[PDB]
Scaffold this active site. Structure first.
Site, short mmCIF file in Angstrom:
data_model
loop_
_atom_site.label_atom_id
_atom_site.label_comp_id
_atom_site.label_asym_id
_atom_site.label_seq_id
_atom_site.Cartn_x
_atom_site.Cartn_y
_atom_site.Cartn_z
N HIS A 107 -5.38 1.75 5.58
CA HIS A 107 -5.01 2.00 6.96
C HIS A 107 -5.07 0.75 7.82
O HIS A 107 -4.52 0.74 8.92
CB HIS A 107 -5.88 3.09 7.56
CG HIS A 107 -5.57 4.45 7.02
ND1 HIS A 107 -6.32 5.57 7.33
CD2 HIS A 107 -4.59 4.87 6.19
CE1 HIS A 107 -5.81 6.62 6.72
NE2 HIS A 107 -4.76 6.22 6.01
N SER A 123 0.91 2.13 4.47
CA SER A 123 1.35 2.60 3.17
C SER A 123 2.70 1.99 2.79
O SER A 123 3.34 1.29 3.57
CB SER A 123 1.40 4.12 3.14
OG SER A 123 0.11 4.68 3.32
N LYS A 168 2.91 19.08 1.90
CA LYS A 168 3.38 18.54 0.62
C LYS A 168 2.21 18.28 -0.33
O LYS A 168 2.31 18.54 -1.54
CB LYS A 168 4.19 17.28 0.87
CG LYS A 168 4.81 16.66 -0.37
CD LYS A 168 5.74 15.53 0.02
CE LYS A 168 6.44 14.92 -1.17
NZ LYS A 168 5.51 14.15 -2.03
N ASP A 169 1.09 17.81 0.21
CA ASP A 169 -0.11 17.63 -0.60
C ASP A 169 -0.71 18.96 -0.99
O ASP A 169 -1.31 19.06 -2.06
CB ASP A 169 -1.13 16.80 0.16
CG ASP A 169 -0.73 15.35 0.27
OD1 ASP A 169 0.01 14.87 -0.61
OD2 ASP A 169 -1.14 14.69 1.25
N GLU A 227 -13.81 9.82 -26.40
CA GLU A 227 -12.74 10.68 -25.93
C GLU A 227 -11.50 9.84 -25.63
O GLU A 227 -11.57 8.61 -25.52
CB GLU A 227 -13.24 11.49 -24.72
CG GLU A 227 -12.37 12.65 -24.23
CD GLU A 227 -12.22 13.76 -25.25
OE1 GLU A 227 -13.15 13.97 -26.06
OE2 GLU A 227 -11.16 14.41 -25.25
C1 HEM Z 1 -10.98 5.99 -7.47
C2 HEM Z 1 -9.88 6.73 -7.35
C3 HEM Z 1 -8.95 6.46 -6.25
C4 HEM Z 1 -8.81 7.16 -5.11
C5 HEM Z 1 -9.61 8.38 -4.71
C6 HEM Z 1 -7.79 6.54 -4.36
C7 HEM Z 1 -7.43 7.04 -3.12
C8 HEM Z 1 -6.28 6.62 -2.51
C9 HEM Z 1 -5.69 7.22 -1.40
C10 HEM Z 1 -6.22 8.43 -0.68
C11 HEM Z 1 -4.58 6.50 -1.11
C12 HEM Z 1 -3.61 6.79 0.01
C13 HEM Z 1 -2.59 7.86 -0.39
C14 HEM Z 1 -1.88 7.49 -1.67
O1 HEM Z 1 -0.87 6.84 -1.64
O2 HEM Z 1 -2.38 7.88 -2.86
C15 HEM Z 1 -4.48 5.45 -2.04
C16 HEM Z 1 -3.46 4.53 -2.03
C17 HEM Z 1 -3.48 3.41 -2.84
N1 HEM Z 1 -4.33 3.11 -3.82
FE1 HEM Z 1 -5.84 4.27 -4.39
N2 HEM Z 1 -7.31 5.48 -5.02
C18 HEM Z 1 -7.96 5.37 -6.18
C19 HEM Z 1 -7.82 4.44 -7.20
C20 HEM Z 1 -7.03 3.33 -7.03
C21 HEM Z 1 -6.92 2.28 -7.93
C22 HEM Z 1 -7.67 2.14 -9.22
C23 HEM Z 1 -6.02 1.40 -7.40
C24 HEM Z 1 -5.62 0.13 -8.02
C25 HEM Z 1 -6.34 -0.95 -7.80
C26 HEM Z 1 -5.55 1.93 -6.18
C27 HEM Z 1 -4.62 1.29 -5.39
C28 HEM Z 1 -3.99 1.95 -4.34
C29 HEM Z 1 -2.83 1.42 -3.64
C30 HEM Z 1 -2.13 0.11 -3.93
C31 HEM Z 1 -2.51 2.33 -2.71
C32 HEM Z 1 -1.38 2.26 -1.72
C33 HEM Z 1 -0.12 2.81 -2.38
C34 HEM Z 1 0.92 3.03 -1.31
O3 HEM Z 1 0.85 2.38 -0.14
O4 HEM Z 1 1.82 3.81 -1.51
N3 HEM Z 1 -6.18 3.12 -5.98
N4 HEM Z 1 -5.55 5.54 -2.89
#
Ligand code: HEM
Ligand code: HEM
Lengths: 83, 55, 73, 378, 89, 100
Positions: free
Chosen positions: D200, D204, D226-227, D270
């Site tokens: 934020h 995004s 949608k979610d 696993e």
């Molecule tokens: C631990 C589990 C994770 C959770 C709960 C999480 C949670 C979220 C959430 C809530 C968002 C915003 C909504 C979405 O586009 O999904 C997000 C976006 C994002 N996450 Fe994660 N995330 C996780 C793991 C990761 C990992 C491992 C990466 C890679 C390093 C990552 C990279 C990103 C990126 C680059 C975005 C932005 C994507 C976009 O702008 O469309 N996330 N994440």
């Protein structure tokens, strides 16, 4: 040609009102109507129009202020609910 | 049917919530009877109610 | 990155937007969704599929190599 | 004025879930944030109720979880929810990572770093939770990975004797692993809030890579419903998994009491660790294999620092896209080779697949990027 | 109601608004309604009938919204639709 | 040379022509790209953001344009490139002046 056709059709017989408000006499008013407007000798619309309801927006950022209007379909004339 | 239904049960929020809770209980009852009837119907025979009905 | 009001400066644009109750729930689903998904499928056949047929060919090759090694002894 | 814009918690709610200017271009591949969050809170609930009926001791764990699945009401489905929800969480985590690599959103640097640390934490939580049921597979895999941590010269021996509480996996090791699996998802949620904070900060990302600041639709009520759609899809898939085929994922040997002498021959971790394990057994070096795994995660760190393209995503770079799909097939190849016994043609193709993994992600990405670069009059 | 009385009275002052009123009354109706009948129908108004009519002509309509200028802050149409009907907050 | 035909095959298989886009659209943004976009006339800037918003709509709904409105390899009015050249040369000017 279309202008003459428009002027000849959309004006003549039922759909015109002369009105006079102020310091005069109604009897002489109808007498002048007899004098001039008599002999006009004239001789198919108003469907219900579908209100859509939608939003148009002009993103035009050159102007400083902002103008926003919002409306709904108004009831009309034959209702005291208009009052 | 639709106009009657919208003019009655879709203009006050609390009455809407109350009637969907009441209909939810009635639908829960009807779904209990339907689902139990179907699952006992496609596995007739080897069910404990009839083996207890033996005794 | 911030909220609305300060993001972009765009003139010359009028967006028309229709009411949700104005239009259908499913406007021409079958007459459009099937050719659109055919177009999206043809747009990814030679990019997505040739890795997986390599996966299946190496799968069957290594599998039958294991079987041939374990059926003579 | 407006109650949402006055109360300080409601200001946080407004900036989080209402007045977030979101890209209007994102399909179902962006629902994964809500999917992972709802998976996380359901894992919290299932593990909490398990902890209300679990006994952390080597003698009593197997019998107590048996008492749960046979005697405590619905404990069988709550255990199945916890394990298969971990598997569904892993599916959504891999596809979240795949979106973040495919659509070029990995240019967000510190957000990617926070995600890497989250990946560490979820791996550790997963492994120690898998240790907890006191199975034969869990016992031997814990012994193997504890010796993998003893591979470190002069530091690893003291560190492994420090994490033992004995000579081997005894009651001290069992209770310590219970404590760490029992505490870690709160820290995961905190770093998830940090992840959300940096996103934020940035904003995004859309499929195009062009910033959609001229076309921002709000986060509510569009993305909320949608979610909800994606979440109830996850609900139906997960619950049909736990109520129709519970045994498509779980190992058979997981239902055995731990024998400290057996070592059954199909010993494996696993499936979400087998690609971590196939790199190990296809390299004849203990420290070399664990360094290869750590360097695979460090390659996942590196890949934001090698984006030598001039677009953002590979959406309009089809060569790098085809290399990405070859990498997808290579990941599933390494997972299946992790799911095989140690065999000589399997050894050959596993070594070739691991070196192919390194050569595609390390070497072939700037090569494909520079062919795409110089091809376009640049 | 007192504002509407005073507004109609100061609206119909002079000769141009009076003659305009006569023309528009005899176009919409064919006849002219003098202001005493309007006063009686003002006396025909309480708050219950008002909220009935406002429930008729506002409560979850499909409105028409027109925006002009730098209207980035202007919400999407579904925000207007959500804030249109109360859920009693 | 046949490399022009290879570029033609690539520009066919890209898809932003099918989306009706130019080469000056999908540049990844550093701050130098931001400066280069800021160093443009008003007409091309407004036409560019009009193209971007049409592309975002047709990318959301995925109903991509007919064949006739697709831009071509010849008519690609690329214009950001000399501005990008001047921005990167000023940046190299500054780097060379600091490292001197
Ligand atoms: C631990 C589990 C994770 C959770 C709960 C999480 C949670 C979220 C959430 C809530 C968002 C915003 C909504 C979405 O586009 O999904 C997000 C976006 C994002 N996450 Fe994660 N995330 C996780 C793991 C990761 C990992 C491992 C990466 C890679 C390093 C990552 C990279 C990103 C990126 C680059 C975005 C932005 C994507 C976009 O702008 O469309 N996330 N994440
Ligand atoms: C703080 C919240 C959590 C608690 C209290 C908790 C507690 C437990 C307990 C007591 C067990 C052993 C009982 C059993 O195996 O059914 C367990 C197993 C497990 N947990 Fe968790 N857990 C939590 C969060 C998570 C999370 C977030 C994941 C990853 C998604 C996870 C993945 C697992 C796995 C894979 C097992 C092994 C399942 C099995 O073999 O039956 N747990 N957890």
């Amino acid at each position: 040609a279309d202008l003459t056709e428009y002027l000849s059709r959309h004006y003549k017989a039922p759909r015109m009102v002369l009105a006079a408000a102020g310091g005069l006499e109604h009897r002489q008013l109808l007498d002048l109507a007899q004098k001039h407007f008599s002999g006009l000798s004239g001789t198919p619309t108003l469907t219900p129009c579908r209100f859509t309801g939608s939003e148009i927006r002009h993103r035009e950022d050159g102007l400083p202020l902002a103008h926003v209007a919002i409306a709904v379909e108004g009831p009309g004339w034959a209702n005291p609910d208009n009052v | 049917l639709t106009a009657r239904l919208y003019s009655l049960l879709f203009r006050r929020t609390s009455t809407f919530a109350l009637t969907i809770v009441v209909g939810a209980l009635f639908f829960e009852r009807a779904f209990d009877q339907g689902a139990d009837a179907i699952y006992e119907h496609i596995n007739e025979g080897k069910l404990w109610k009839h083996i207890k009905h033996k005794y | 990155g911030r909220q609305f009001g300060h993001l972009t400066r765009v003139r010359h644009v009028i967006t028309y937007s229709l009411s949700p109750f104005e239009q259908r729930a499913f406007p021409h689903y079958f007459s459009k969704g099937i050719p659109n998904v055919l177009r999206r499928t043809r747009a990814c056949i030679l990019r997505v599929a040739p890795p997986f047929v390599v996966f299946y060919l190496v799968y069957t090759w290594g599998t039958q190599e294991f079987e041939k090694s374990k059926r003579k002894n | 004025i407006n109650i949402r814009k006055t109360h300080p918690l409601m200001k946080i709610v407004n900036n989080a879930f209402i007045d977030l200017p979101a890209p209007s271009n994102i399909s179902s591949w962006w629902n994964f944030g809500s999917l992972l969050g709802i998976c996380l809170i359901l894992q919290i609930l299932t593990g909490l109720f398990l902890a209300m009926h679990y006994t952390p001791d080597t003698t009593t764990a197997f019998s107590s979880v048996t008492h749960i699945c046979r005697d405590v009401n619905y404990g069988w489905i709550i255990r199945y929810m916890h394990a298969n929800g971990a598997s569904m969480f892993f599916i959504c985590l891999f596809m979240h990572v795949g979106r973040g690599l495919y659509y070029g959103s990995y240019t967000f640097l510190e957000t990617w770093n926070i995600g890497v640390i989250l990946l560490f934490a979820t791996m550790a939580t997963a492994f120690m939770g898998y240790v907890l049921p006191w199975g034969q597979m869990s016992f031997w895999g814990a012994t193997v990975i504890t010796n993998l941590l003893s591979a470190i010269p002069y530091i690893g021996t003291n560190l492994v004797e420090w994490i033992w509480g004995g000579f081997s996996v005894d009651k001290a090791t069992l209770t310590r692993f219970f404590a760490f699996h029992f505490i870690f998802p709160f820290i995961i949620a905190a770093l998830a809030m940090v992840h959300l904070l940096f996103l934020h900060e940035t904003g995004s990302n859309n499929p195009t890579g062009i910033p959609s600041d001229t076309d921002k639709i709000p986060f509510h009520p569009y993305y909320t419903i949608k979610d909800i759609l994606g979440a109830i899809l996850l609900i139906l898939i997960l619950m049909l998994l736990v109520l129709f085929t519970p045994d498509l994922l779980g190992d058979p040997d997981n239902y055995t009491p731990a024998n400290p002498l057996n070592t059954p021959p199909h010993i494996k971790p696993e499936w979400y660790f087998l690609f971590a394990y196939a790199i190990l057994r296809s390299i004849p070096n203990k420290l070399g294999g664990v360094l290869a795994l750590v360097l695979s995660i460090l390659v996942l760190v590196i890949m934001p620092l090698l984006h030598t393209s001039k677009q953002r995503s590979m959406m309009f770079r089809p060569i790098s896209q085809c290399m990405f799909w070859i990498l997808v097939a290579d990941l599933l190849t390494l997972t299946w080779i992790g799911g095989q016994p140690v065999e000589h043609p399997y050894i050959i193709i596993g070594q070739l697949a691991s070196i192919m993994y390194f050569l595609i992600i390390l070497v072939m990405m700037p090569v494909a990027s520079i062919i795409e670069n110089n091809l376009l009059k640049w | 109601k007192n504002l509407l009385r005073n507004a109609l009275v100061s609206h119909l002052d002079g000769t141009t608004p009076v003659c305009e009123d006569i023309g528009r009354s005899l176009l919409t109706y064919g006849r002219r309604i003098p202001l005493a009948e309007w006063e009686s129908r003002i006396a025909e108004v309480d708050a219950r009938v008002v909220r009935e009519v406002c429930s008729k002509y506002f409560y979850d309509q499909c409105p028409a919204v027109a925006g002009f200028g730098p209207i980035e802050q202007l919400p999407d149409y579904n925000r207007i639709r959500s804030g249109m009907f109360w859920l009693r907050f | 040379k046949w490399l022009e035909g290879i570029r033609k095959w690539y520009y066919n298989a890209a898809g932003f022509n099918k989306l009706g886009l130019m080469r000056d659209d999908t540049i990844h943004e550093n701050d130098d790209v931001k400066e280069a976009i800021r160093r443009l006339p008003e007409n091309l800037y407004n036409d560019r953001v009009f193209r971007i918003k049409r592309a975002l709509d047709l990318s959301m709904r995925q109903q991509i344009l007919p064949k006739e409105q697709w831009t071509k390899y010849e008519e690609d009015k690329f214009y950001l490139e000399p501005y990008l050249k001047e921005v990167i040369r000023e940046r190299k000017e500054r780097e060379e002046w600091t490292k001197k």
